[PDB]
Amino acid sequence: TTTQSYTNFTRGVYYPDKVFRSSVLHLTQDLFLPFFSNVTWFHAISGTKRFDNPVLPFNDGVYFASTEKSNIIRGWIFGTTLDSKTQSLLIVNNATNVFIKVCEFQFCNDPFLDVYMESESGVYSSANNCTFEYVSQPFLKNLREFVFKNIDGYFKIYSKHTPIIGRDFPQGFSALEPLVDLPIGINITRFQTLLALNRSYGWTAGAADYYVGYLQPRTFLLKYNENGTITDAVDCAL
Amino acid sequence: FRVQPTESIVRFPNVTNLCPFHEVFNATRFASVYAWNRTRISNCVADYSVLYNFAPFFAFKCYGVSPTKLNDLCFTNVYADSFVIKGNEVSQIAPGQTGNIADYNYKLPDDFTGCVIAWNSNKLDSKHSGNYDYWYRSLRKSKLKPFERDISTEIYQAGNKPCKGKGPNCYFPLESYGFRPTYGVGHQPYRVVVLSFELLHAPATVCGPKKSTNLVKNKCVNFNFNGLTGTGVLTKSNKKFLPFQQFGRDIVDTTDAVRDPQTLEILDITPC
Ligand SMILES: *[C@@H]1O[C@H](CO)[C@@H](O[C@@H]2O[C@H](CO)[C@@H](O)[C@H](O)[C@H]2NC(C)=O)[C@H](O)[C@H]1NC(C)=O
Ligand SMILES: *[C@@H]1O[C@H](CO)[C@@H](O)[C@H](O)[C@H]1NC(C)=O
Ligand SMILES: *[C@@H]1O[C@H](CO)[C@@H](O)[C@H](O)[C@H]1NC(C)=O
Ligand SMILES: *[C@@H]1O[C@H](CO)[C@@H](O)[C@H](O)[C@H]1NC(C)=O
Ligand SMILES: *[C@@H]1O[C@H](CO)[C@@H](O)[C@H](O)[C@H]1NC(C)=O
Ligand SMILES: *[C@@H]1O[C@H](CO)[C@@H](O)[C@H](O)[C@H]1NC(C)=O
Ligand SMILES: *[C@@H]1O[C@H](CO)[C@@H](O)[C@H](O)[C@H]1NC(C)=O
Ligand SMILES: *[C@@H]1O[C@H](CO)[C@@H](O)[C@H](O)[C@H]1NC(C)=O
Ligand SMILES: *[C@@H]1O[C@H](CO)[C@@H](O)[C@H](O)[C@H]1NC(C)=O
Ligand SMILES: *[C@@H]1O[C@H](CO)[C@@H](O)[C@H](O)[C@H]1NC(C)=O
């Protein structure tokens, strides 16, 4: 949409491993959102939408977050060309489940879903040569944070849902937890946020905000408390 | 004197779904090496004795986990990359070798920890008039990286021309293996399956055919939890593991707790 930049996000820390630690100062080198990084803020009001969805670079990994009350953002598209020439990853959310499909898609010129039920044909005209399907529970006032990392053929999704009672991001620390490890082997260089903007059956429709940051290799200290929950972290490169 | 282990306890997941090794090895047709067939083995019991039942093998050559006694391990994921290559190119599947296959069709990682299984298929993959179904790539602009499949058949650039049309200097990127029943062993087809093993302790498992036994607590026990083995005393833990954590570590980064494969109860481990 239209992108402001934000310099003050102290967020994006996640559990780098699958091993429990408590009361530990742990030093690790991994892909993290740097503290005080340049994070782009996307703000759209929905005639159809504020502006047609942009396609963003993926780089090393993506930090995605939103505080959306209208529940319009319900998925992402990941891949290279994002057309019928290559295989791509479609992650969509709905009222009952999360549907992840890896196939050779031909997404339509207008990526955004039409919600009126939901019609799959509003995202892509067709898809073939499908190799992977997987179903999870819905990823759902509340600020929804996700980290998408593409490492050694595995698409790893981390997430957290943190309640907010004000307008601004909470001033505090919250670490993301692993959500799903997808054994795909997909080459991802570009991605797009999919907006499930409904027809108000030129029309007025609900707004959608999100924040996008990028991960970089960094060394961090992570403070693990008695319950093994990360409560603080120090970016050793800052 | 009971400081030494007084019991031997094996705990593995209760999985009765046999891994589909027969189907990948006994497939009617195999993919060309330039576009090998990559499948995935998971959520199954990794019984490897069936491989010896399947066929006599030319080479087995497990790397990294060099022992072939794989029935005691649990892998997070197992991949199987199947293809047909000629006998003289079998040696090019080893991680450190070069040549037409290692460089342009199937580069294997230098730190690869799996097994390369080769089977002579001269009676199956060689037609009287010649088997021309199998293709291999010989021309690329760069060397192939580990586990990438370069599928495109776009004509390979040559000389200083835009390279449109074949013959004068441009080449089709694939050459084909015209297999004949009368060729010697060096030129006979071989069906090669590379089993890629991810040994990362055990955040998830594909375990071999081990029989789990009952847990013993408050005793010095020789234990094996999934892919992690050791000696110690098992006790009920009061640690709060997250739903996704399978293990724990002490302040010195050594194992001090496990999640039981059958009950998901967290147990602490104290050395004897
Ligand atoms: C590549 O491997 C896949 C396995 O993941 C093969 O797909 C199986 O093919 C057999 C053929 O008899 C079927 O019975 C299975 O049900 C298939 N399973 C799946 C998940 O597709 C595929 O045929 C292989 N391709 C080649 C060319 O060997
Ligand atoms: C800095 O953070 C506060 C929240 O603590 C936010 O309101 C403010 O907009 C941020 N700074 C910029 C550059 O907008
Ligand atoms: C952040 O990056 C965007 C381009 O992606 C740029 O427009 C913006 O000025 C940058 N902000 C800072 C503070 O460097
Ligand atoms: C959500 O997507 C799954 C994927 O197939 C589908 O089975 C389910 O019915 C969908 N739910 C709704 C409410 O559309
Ligand atoms: C699927 O892949 C095969 C590979 O040979 C190709 O020939 C076929 O056209 C593809 N079909 C699609 C993308 O619909
Ligand atoms: C992934 O896509 C980028 C951009 O097209 C390309 O440069 C890179 O070589 C690709 N890698 C693989 C393994 O396909
Ligand atoms: C469409 O969405 C808007 C808010 O985005 C909502 O107020 C309206 O009732 C919706 N209409 C239908 C038919 O779902
Ligand atoms: C961790 O221990 C308790 C156990 O539930 C937890 O509620 C609290 O947040 C933590 N207590 C201390 C003392 O760290
Ligand atoms: C493979 O499948 C054929 C199908 O008839 C069967 O006869 C044979 O015993 C199977 N096993 C081997 C090792 O060929
Ligand atoms: C089989 O394993 C599952 C894993 O959660 C466990 O819940 C179940 O009780 C096991 N079966 C038996 C008979 O104990």
Author numbering:
A (entry chain A): 23 to 30, 32 to 69, 73 to 142, 150 to 173, 184 to 244, 253 to 289
B (entry chain C): 318 to 482, 484 to 590
Cite, word for word, the article reporting this structure.
The JN.1-sublineage KP.3.1.1 recently emerged as the globally prevalent SARS-CoV-2 variant, demonstrating increased infectivity and antibody escape. We investigate how mutations and a deletion in the KP.3.1.1 spike protein (S) affect hACE2 binding and antibody escape. The spike proteins exhibited three conformational states: “one RBD up,” “all RBD down,” and “flexible” (i.e., one or two RBDs disordered in the density maps due to flexibility).
KP.3.1.1 contains only one additional change compared to KP.3, a deletion in the NTD (S31Δ). To observe a clearer structure of the KP.3.1.1 NTD, we performed local refinement of the NTD and its adjacent RBD. Local refinement of KP.3.1.1 NTD showed that S31Δ results in a 180° flip of the F32 side-chain rotamer into a hydrophobic pocket formed by L56, V62, Y91, F216, and Y266. In the cryo-EM structure of the spike protein of KP.3.1.1, we observed N30 glycosylation and a 180° flip of the F32 side chain, resulting from the S31 deletion in the 30NSFT33 motif. In addition, N30 is located in NTD “site vi,” which comprises the binding sites for known antibodies, including the neutralizing antibody C1717 and non-neutralizing antibodies DH1052, COV57, and S2M24.31,32-34 Through a structural comparison and binding assay, we showed that N30 glycosylation is positioned so that it knocks out binding to mAb C1717. Magnified views of KP.3.1.1, RaTG13, Pangolin-CoV-GD, and Pangolin-CoV-GX indicated that N30 and its attached glycan are spatially proximal to N61.
